[PDB]
Ligand binder design. Structure first.
Ligand SMILES: CCCCCCCC/C=C\CCCCCCCC(=O)OC[C@H](O)CO
Ligand SMILES: CCCCCCCC/C=C\CCCCCCCC(=O)OC[C@H](O)CO
Ligand SMILES: CCCCCCCC/C=C\CCCCCCCC(=O)OC[C@H](O)CO
Ligand SMILES: CCCCCCCC/C=C\CCCCCCCC(=O)OC[C@H](O)CO
Ligand SMILES: CCCCCCCC/C=C\CCCCCCCC(=O)O
Ligand SMILES: CCCCCCCC/C=C\CCCCCCCC(=O)O
Ligand SMILES: CCCCCCCC/C=C\CCCCCCCC(=O)O
Ligand SMILES: CCCCCCCC/C=C\CCCCCCCC(=O)O
Ligand SMILES: CCCCCCCC/C=C\CCCCCCCC(=O)O
Ligand SMILES: CCCCCCCC/C=C\CCCCCCCC(=O)O
Length: 492
C-alpha cells in the first residue's frame, strides 16, 4: 500500500468545477461505460427474440428473458470477484483499464454480424469486464480527496449522477438507433461509447490520478500466488473437461446454465449466512444481528426482483402489450428503459429533503425497507389492471409509466439505506465483505427472476403480476410489523 497523503500529493486538486480534474476522468470513464452497458441492455432482449428476418436471433421470448436475468445476476456477482482482483492482484487503476478493454471487446462481438455464439462470447466478456471496471473506478474517486476534504460527498454525488445520466440517455441514443435502423448499429454505438471511456481514461489518468489505484493494496504472498495459480489452472482444466463431454452428450445447455445460476442464487446467500453465524470471530451480539439482517436481506431480494424485472419482463411488456402508436407517433419500446433513471434524477432530491424535514420523525431503516417493498408490490398490482380490465389488445402506455414511477418511490426508500443496514448488522470481522453482501441480495433476486420467466405469458399475466406483487405486499406488511425490534437492535 501507499499512504493516503502521498497519494493525495500526487493528485491535482483542481480543474473540474471546483473538484480535482481526476473527477473528470472518472466521471466520463464511468459515464461512457454505463452509457454503453445500458444502451446495449435496452435493446438486447429484443435482439434475442425478434425474428431473424427482423435482424434478431429468433430465440423464444422466454429464453431471452431468462438469459437477460442471468446476465444481470452474473454482472452483480462479477463485481465481487472484480473487487478482489483489484484489491489483491491488479490495483484499481489497472482493473479499470483491463475491464474497459474486455467490455469494449464484448460490444464489438455484438456489433459485427453474428448469431447466438457471438452473444454468449459478448456476455462473458462484458460480465468479466464490468466486474473489473465498475466497482474499481468508484474506489479511485475516494482516492483523489485528502482526508478531511469537504468536497468528497459532493464529488461522489457528481460521479454517481453520471451513472444515472448514462442510464437515461443510452436508451434514447442506442435504443433509437438499434430499433429504428439495425440492431448491430446499436451495438456499434455502444462499442464506440466504451471506446470513448477508454480513451479518456488512458489519455488523462497519468496527470489526473497520479498514484491513485496504481498499487496493490492487499497483495498475495509468494506462496499464495502459487496456490492461486494452481487452483485456477486445475479449475480451468476441470471446467473444460466437463463441457467437452457435456455440451454434446451431457447434456449441458443454456437451460442447465440458467438452472445452475438459479441454484447458486439460493445456495450462496445461505452459505454466507451460515459462515457469518457460525464464525468463531464473532460476538454473541453480532450473531443476533446476523439473524436480524435476514428479513432485511429477504426484503431486499424481493424488492430487486421486481425492480430488475423493469429491464426484462416490463421490456417485453413495452414491446408486446403496450400501445406504442400514440399521439401520431411511434414510441420505441426501448425508450421505457429511460424512465427509471429519469424518475431517480427528479425524485432523489425531493426524498432527501423529505427525510431532512422529517428528522426524528422519519421512518427507521427497517421501515424504509418495508416501504420499498410495499411500493414494489403496488407497482405490479397497478400493471396487471389494464390487461385485466380490457378484453384484450394493447394497453395505454400511461400504465407502464405509472408502474415505473411507483417502483422508483420504493427504490428511494430502500436503496439508499441498503448499504447502511448491511454494515450495521454484519459482524466486525466481516466488515470488508459488506458491499458484496448488499450486492448479493440483488444477484440472488435476478437469479431467481430467471426461473420465474416461464410463468410470464399473455394467458396468466394477471396471476403473474398479482402473485409477485401480492407476495411483496405481504412481505412488506410482515417487515413493518417486526421493524420495531430490528431497528432498536441496529448498531449505529
Ligand atoms: C484478464 C482478465 C482477467 C484476469 C484474471 C487474472 C487472475 C489472477 C489471479 C491471481 C493469480 C496470481 O498468481 O496472483 C498473483 C498476484 O499478483 C498476487 O498479488
Ligand atoms: C427471496 C425473494 C425472491 C423474490 C421472489 C418472489 C416470487 C414470488 C413467487 C412467484 C410465483 C410465480 C407467480 C405465478 O405465476 O403463480 C401462478 C399461480 O399463482 C399458481 O398457479
Ligand atoms: C395517471 C392515471 C393513469 C390512469 C390512466 C388510465 C387511462 C388509460 C386507460 O383508460 O386504460 C384502459 C384500461 O384498460 C381500462 O381501465
Ligand atoms: C391491521 C394491520 C396493522 C399492521 C400495521 C403494521 C404495523 O403495525 O406497524 C407498526 C410498526 O411500528 C411499524 O414498523
Ligand atoms: C477477430 C475480430 C475481427 C474484428 C472486426 C472485423 C470484422 C469485420 C466484419 C466481420 C464479418 C464476419 C461475417 O461476415 O459474419
Ligand atoms: C471470456 C473472457 C475470457 C478471456 C479473458 C481472460 C484472459 C486471461 C489471461 C491471463 C491473465 C493474466 C494477464 C494479466 C495482466 C497483468 C498486468 C499486471 O499485473 O501488471
Ligand atoms: C495462470 C496464472 C496467470 C495469472 C497471473 C497474472 C497476475 C499478474 C499480477 C501481477
Ligand atoms: C422520457 C422518455 C421515455 C418516454 C417513454 C414513454 C412515455 C409515455 C407516453 C405516454
Ligand atoms: C436529463 C435528466 C432529466 C432532466 C430533468 C431533471 C429535472 C431536475 C432534476 C434535479 C437535479
Ligand atoms: C410518496 C413518497 C413518500 C413515501 C413514503 C414516506 C413516508 C414517510 C413517513 C411519514 C411519517
Amino acid at each position: 500500500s501507499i499512504d493516503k497523503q502521498q497519494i493525495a500529493a500526487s493528485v491535482p486538486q483542481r480543474g473540474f468545477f471546483g473538484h480535482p480534474k481526476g473527477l473528470f476522468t472518472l466521471f466520463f470513464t464511468e459515464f461512457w461505460e454505463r452509457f454503453s452497458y445500458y444502451g446495449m441492455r435496452a435493446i438486447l432482449v429484443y435482439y434475442m427474440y425478434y425474428e431473424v428476418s427482423k435482424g434478431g436471433l429468433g430465440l423464444d421470448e422466454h429464453l431471452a428473458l431468462a438469459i437477460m436475468s442471468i446476465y444481470g445476476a452474473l454482472v452483480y456477482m462479477s463485481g465481487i470477484i472484480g473487487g478482489w482482483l483489484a484489491d489483491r492482484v491488479f490495483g484499481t487503476s489497472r482493473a479499470v483499464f483491463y475491464g474497459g478493454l474486455l467490455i469494449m471487446a464484448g460490444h464489438i462481438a455484438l456489433a459485427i454480424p453474428g448469431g447466438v455464439a457471438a452473444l454468449f462470447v459478448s456476455m462473458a466478456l462484458i460480465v468479466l469486464g464490468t466486474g473489473l471496471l465498475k466497482p474499481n473506478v468508484s474506489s479511485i474517486v475516494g482516492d483523489m480527496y485528502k482526508p478531511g476534504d469537504d468536497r468528497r460527498d459532493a464529488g461522489f454525488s457528481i460521479f454517481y449522477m453520471g451513472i444515472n445520466l448514462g442510464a437515461f440517455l443510452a436508451p434514447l441514443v442506442v435504443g433509437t438507433a438499434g430499433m429504428k435502423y439495425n440492431f448491430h448499429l446499436g451495438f456499434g454505438l455502444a462499442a464506440v461509447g466504451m471506446f470513448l471511456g477508454l480513451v479518456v481514461f488512458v489519455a488523462t489518468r497519468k496527470k489526473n490520478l497520479g498514484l491513485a489505484g496504481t498499487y496493490v493494496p492487499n497483495p498475495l504472498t509468494p506462496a499464495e500466488k502459487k496456490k492461486a495459480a494452481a487452483i485456477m489452472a486445475v479449475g480451468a482444466v476441470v471446467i473444460a473437461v466437463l463441457l467437452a463431454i457435456l455440451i454434446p452428450n451431457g447434456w449441458f445447455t443454456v437451460e442447465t446454465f440458467i438452472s445452475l445460476v438459479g441454484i447458486l442464487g439460493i445456495i450462496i446467500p445461505i452459505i454466507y449466512f451460515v459462515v457469518m453465524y457460525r464464525s468463531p470471530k464473532t460476538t454473541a451480539e453480532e450473531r443476533s444481528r446476523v439473524i436480524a439482517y435476514i428479513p432485511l436481506f429477504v426484503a431486499s431480494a424481493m424488492f430487486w426482483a421486481i425492480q430488475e424485472q423493469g429491464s426484462t419482463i416490463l421490456a417485453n411488456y413495452a414491446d408486446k402489450r403496450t400501445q406504442l402508436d400514440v399521439a401520431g407517433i411511434h414510441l420505441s419500446p426501448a425508450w421505457f428503459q429511460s424512465l427509471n433513471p429519469l424518475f431517480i434524477i427528479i425524485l432523489a432530491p425531493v426524498f432527501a429533503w423529505m427525510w431532512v424535514k422529517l428528522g426524528k420523525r422519519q421512518p427507521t431503516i427497517p421501515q424504509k425497507f418495508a416501504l420499498g417493498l410495499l411500493f414494489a408490490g403496488l407497482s405490479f398490482i397497478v400493471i396487471l389492471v389494464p390487461g385485466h380490465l380490457s378484453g384484450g389488445g394493447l394497453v395505454h402506455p400511461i400504465w407502464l409509466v405509472l408502474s415505473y414511477f411507483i417502483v422508483v418511490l420504493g427504490e428511494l426508500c430502500l436503496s439508499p439505506v441498503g448499504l447502511s443496514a448491511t454494515t450495521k448488522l454484519a459482524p466486525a470481522a466481516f466488515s470488508a465483505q459488506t458491499m458484496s453482501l448488499w450486492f448479493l441480495s440483488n444477484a440472488a433476486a435476478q437469479a431467481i427472476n430467471a426461473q420465474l420467466v416461464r410463468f410470464y405469458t399473455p394467458e396468466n399475466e394477471t396471476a403473474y403480476f398479482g402473485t409477485i406483487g401480492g407476495a411483496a405486499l405481504v412481505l412488506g406488511l410482515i417487515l413493518l410489523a417486526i421493524a420495531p425490534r430490528i431497528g432498536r437492535l441496529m448498531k449505529g
